[PDB]
Design a protein around this ligand. Sequence first.
Ligand SMILES: NC(=O)c1ccc[n+]([C@@H]2O[C@H](COP(=O)([O-])OP(=O)(O)OC[C@H]3O[C@@H](n4cnc5c(N)ncnc54)[C@H](O)[C@@H]3O)[C@@H](O)[C@H]2O)c1
Ligand SMILES: NC(=O)c1ccc[n+]([C@@H]2O[C@H](COP(=O)([O-])OP(=O)(O)OC[C@H]3O[C@@H](n4cnc5c(N)ncnc54)[C@H](O)[C@@H]3O)[C@@H](O)[C@H]2O)c1
Ligand SMILES: NC(=O)c1ccc[n+]([C@@H]2O[C@H](COP(=O)([O-])OP(=O)(O)OC[C@H]3O[C@@H](n4cnc5c(N)ncnc54)[C@H](O)[C@@H]3O)[C@@H](O)[C@H]2O)c1
Ligand SMILES: NC(=O)c1ccc[n+]([C@@H]2O[C@H](COP(=O)([O-])OP(=O)(O)OC[C@H]3O[C@@H](n4cnc5c(N)ncnc54)[C@H](O)[C@@H]3O)[C@@H](O)[C@H]2O)c1
Ligand SMILES: [Cl-]
Ligand SMILES: [Cl-]
Ligand SMILES: [Cl-]
Ligand SMILES: [Cl-]
Ligand code: NA
Ligand code: NA
Ligand code: NA
Ligand code: NA
Lengths: 268, 268, 268, 268
Amino acid sequence: GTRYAGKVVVVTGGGRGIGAGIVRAFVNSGARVVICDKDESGGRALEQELPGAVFILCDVTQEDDVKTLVSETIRRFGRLDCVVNNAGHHPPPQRPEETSAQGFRQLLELNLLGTYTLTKLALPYLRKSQGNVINISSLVGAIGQAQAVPYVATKGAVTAMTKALALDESPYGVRVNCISPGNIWTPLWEELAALMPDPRASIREGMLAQPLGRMGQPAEVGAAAVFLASEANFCTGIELLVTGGAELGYGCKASRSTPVDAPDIPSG
Amino acid sequence: GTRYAGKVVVVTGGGRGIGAGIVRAFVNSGARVVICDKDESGGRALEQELPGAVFILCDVTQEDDVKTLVSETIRRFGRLDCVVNNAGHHPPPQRPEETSAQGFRQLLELNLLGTYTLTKLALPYLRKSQGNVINISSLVGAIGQAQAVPYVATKGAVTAMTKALALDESPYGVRVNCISPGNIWTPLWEELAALMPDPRASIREGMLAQPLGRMGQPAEVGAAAVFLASEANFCTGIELLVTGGAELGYGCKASRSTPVDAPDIPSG
Amino acid sequence: GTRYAGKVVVVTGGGRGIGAGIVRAFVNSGARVVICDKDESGGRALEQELPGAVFILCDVTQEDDVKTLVSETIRRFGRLDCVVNNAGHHPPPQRPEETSAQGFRQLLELNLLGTYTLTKLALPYLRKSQGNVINISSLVGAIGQAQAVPYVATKGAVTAMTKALALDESPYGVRVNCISPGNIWTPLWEELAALMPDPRASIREGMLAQPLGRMGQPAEVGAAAVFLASEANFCTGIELLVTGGAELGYGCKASRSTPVDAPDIPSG
Amino acid sequence: GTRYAGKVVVVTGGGRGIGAGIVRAFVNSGARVVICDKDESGGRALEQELPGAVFILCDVTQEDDVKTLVSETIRRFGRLDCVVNNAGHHPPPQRPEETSAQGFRQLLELNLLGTYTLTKLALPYLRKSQGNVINISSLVGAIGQAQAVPYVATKGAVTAMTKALALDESPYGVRVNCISPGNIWTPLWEELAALMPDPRASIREGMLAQPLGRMGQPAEVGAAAVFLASEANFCTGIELLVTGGAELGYGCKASRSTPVDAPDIPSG
Ligand SMILES: NC(=O)c1ccc[n+]([C@@H]2O[C@H](COP(=O)([O-])OP(=O)(O)OC[C@H]3O[C@@H](n4cnc5c(N)ncnc54)[C@H](O)[C@@H]3O)[C@@H](O)[C@H]2O)c1
Ligand SMILES: NC(=O)c1ccc[n+]([C@@H]2O[C@H](COP(=O)([O-])OP(=O)(O)OC[C@H]3O[C@@H](n4cnc5c(N)ncnc54)[C@H](O)[C@@H]3O)[C@@H](O)[C@H]2O)c1
Ligand SMILES: NC(=O)c1ccc[n+]([C@@H]2O[C@H](COP(=O)([O-])OP(=O)(O)OC[C@H]3O[C@@H](n4cnc5c(N)ncnc54)[C@H](O)[C@@H]3O)[C@@H](O)[C@H]2O)c1
Ligand SMILES: NC(=O)c1ccc[n+]([C@@H]2O[C@H](COP(=O)([O-])OP(=O)(O)OC[C@H]3O[C@@H](n4cnc5c(N)ncnc54)[C@H](O)[C@@H]3O)[C@@H](O)[C@H]2O)c1
Ligand SMILES: [Cl-]
Ligand SMILES: [Cl-]
Ligand SMILES: [Cl-]
Ligand SMILES: [Cl-]
Ligand code: NA
Ligand code: NA
Ligand code: NA
Ligand code: NA
């Protein structure tokens, strides 16, 4: 209710999904939240519903949109306490030979360099408030994912960059942390499933990937983000897993295209 | 204020240090807290100061003390929602040849088997409440520590056991997580430093081990424990680092007894 | 052929399975190998087949057997260069309420304290040869396993203890490393599968747990052990995974007893 | 001597440093080695000294140089068994505000997209030989480094991409692994130290960062690469640390610009 009262927070990609869940969580903790999104529709709907959230149209791949975002946040609200780098994209499944260097560069511009550019421009103000940075990475940056080489690379970069930033900003008392969600039910997840030959079977496989037996919710990532900003004052450079246990224990991993022998020859 | 209202929580070793910090954090979130400690002095002082905390004398190495602890918690309060396994001990620095199998067994009884015994007896009740378990492990279970072979082994065991329990209890919706603190200023830390030839130099080295430049506080571990119990509903089997960044980046590691060559022969 | 020529190596549990694979790998690299095993049958068969391997009856849970093992190795061969702590046991599947503190203590005596006791007694001689220690841990010490709380705890302890020993022994130039195998087809694996209601289905599930689509071989762990001893002179405190990729990517983890909802409610 | 006999290996950046160490290690194991380097001087010197190593001028940031590299390797030698992606660069120390998006993009082109482009073009041939890929990442991709945000991001990307590739290529039996070196004494390390106000003090700090008390050698990375290619047939997606223990235990991390209080206030 007052956990982060009067702090100014920027959330990129805050118009839907996990970002909207983070926006709602910070508004509920008393913050002024600047929603950054390339999509006017969801950001305007959130700005009208939530007093304390304002919407600024901004594409994080455009350096001038981000400079204006930071410039307007300071002009209109006088300070900056927390940046949540959430804007990102997961392409449909793609084998390595179905990827291009150009597609990889485009994904790096959004998932990695948008996060880098806003952080860099925000740091002079975060240093003045002893604020903090939260990056939304992914579990698959840590354990890999099939048919997702460009995406996995961008999220490994984000998690590592979080630790480098944590070391660079610790002399100012500025913390830098990341959240690595596993499977979270969002519009992105729904849109990816809808491209599969059996969307609900794909969703069910997504649920069975967790020992808890379900996907996570945006509100659960949101609560983790408010914790990191407002109560984790001795945490920096950590990777907070919000994954339902998906990384634990053995599971069925050998793919449908993978030659697997009968169990009378178990080790080749 | 109401984050964990009416939940029943048992905290072992809750009489001082990190455990007292966890006790205070759960009381402040509205829980009924059962303080388990072998030391009557600190537990009675907390029980008298905090309404909502009660003290039950209990040595977690004694199976009968733990059975009575659980039996009395259910008889007096009717449910059990959260177990925090915090009771533990760090011996003074000891080289491997200065350790004994008997000392190692004694430390396993406290740091590992006390945690196992209470968890096992608590599980039938935690399953009924869809409660959760929080184990207090240590960063050095993950990265090692010099002159601490028995201690490091016990904490590696706790962190791993947390993941095994998370897998076993997920069909009941019971989450099992651990917190791995780094250097936290507690009476244990002060007592260990007081055995060194220069206690304040040792404390200063303990502070410089973190990029943040200080040790953590019990209240910071307490906030992380309340987060795990009350708001991390999609987290299970995670290791929440509360370390000030001590695991990040390069640091000075070659010991004072270690032959290090002059910098004209950098790689032997 | 000459990678580890004339070095003296002790392998505990070397009579069958992974230990026999390590024994054969070190003999093939030119070492004198002392097979330690509580079972005379396999050790005698290996000692007669392999010149350069000798067998010494030894139960690593008995401090006097281990002291005699070390005493006889030095008396008969004059030096000690490498200790491989491989002797260990995996109990059948057991839920937490089906485990006992006494069973847990017995498993700690073998999987953890046998490794500790031999290492401690070997260290004075390893320091003189700048030798090294290799511990055989398990992937599940890192990621957990269902129905295996005591076993998982012992292997988390071994992996952590490896790092503590690495720090303590680095001033002497003595390296301490561990190998964490995943599913390796051994007599232990076969005996555990034979206790299941459908042994070959269990073996097939064990094979499908790896992206590579098979279990590993003892000879593959053996090659990793010879690498660590003979060519990894800048590695200490590492955990060398020999797992077929089992820790990578998403897999089916929600258990058969776990309530999982239909895919029209993906996140509860 | 014959560990990898007749296999065809491409090593990018093989003209000096770690790459030259890998080249020599694969030549010594009997392979045909194609040295890829943008620098003619070192590659020609190695090609003339080592029969079995040939040099092909190639800048991995230029897609046409890489296509020609692969085309010429197959035309001249008929197969491809192993790709070692070693070409990379570490910029001088730079604070985040001293970095540019353009510099970051240039570093991604070399450290990440050069590795991606060659792997993608090599995969059709590696699938036919059941070959393997080895990426040279860095420890700091896992633990972060100060004053190196772009570099750390590129190496986090490489390590993660290694795991994604391992999952995608396991149905073909093609393994993909990475080596994460810590401090290795190379010409790059010497050139970076020479930019410091006290180069030998910087080198000495680099040596003290390891419990072993020295930096590693290119030949030690080379031995690890030959192990991964020739004897680690059950390893895929692993990160093989060649770091001297730098990630273990506590060290001095609070920087010279970091406010650290006197030891009478240890936790703020
Ligand atoms: N959903 C999951 O399971 C999952 C798992 C792991 C990580 N993540 C990460 O979480 C983040 C959010 O994922 P989501 O599932 O909520 O996605 P989403 O597609 O549902 O929402 C993403 C939002 O970001 C905005 N956005 C996209 N490109 C932008 C740009 N150039 N500039 C500004 N805004 C932009 C979109 O308009 C949208 O409002 C991403 O970084 C994603 O990689 C998601
Ligand atoms: N202080 C640190 O820097 C640090 C770092 C990492 C982990 N930890 C862990 O945090 C936990 C608490 O540490 P602390 O620093 O607060 O220690 P502490 O000594 O200050 O407090 C520990 C409490 O546990 C109680 N206790 C000890 N043995 C007991 C037993 N047999 N039965 C019941 N209660 C018992 C003690 O009486 C005391 O009240 C331990 O598990 C410790 O290993 C501490
Ligand atoms: N097989 C796997 O999939 C797997 C996976 C991960 C780890 N491991 C570990 O690898 C090691 C070997 O496993 P395995 O599968 O080859 O087992 P195994 O049962 O096939 O062989 C173990 C050997 O150790 C000996 N041994 C047991 N108790 C002993 C004692 N008290 N003193 C001396 N020798 C003793 C046995 O007699 C036997 O010869 C163990 O530490 C095990 O936990 C195995
Ligand atoms: N030296 C260390 O301590 C260290 C630590 C961790 C990781 N690494 C990594 O190891 C690898 C080698 O490092 P090093 O220390 O041996 O470096 P180095 O500078 O000594 O050698 C690198 C070689 O790569 C070549 N190269 C550079 N750009 C190229 C391009 N565009 N196309 C083709 N070849 C190119 C250079 O000409 C040179 O021959 C790098 O990927 C580096 O990031 C090094
Ligand atoms: Cl996957
Ligand atoms: Cl230490
Ligand atoms: Cl499992
Ligand atoms: Cl650093
Ligand atoms: Na508004
Ligand atoms: Na009270
Ligand atoms: Na013999
Ligand atoms: Na040549």
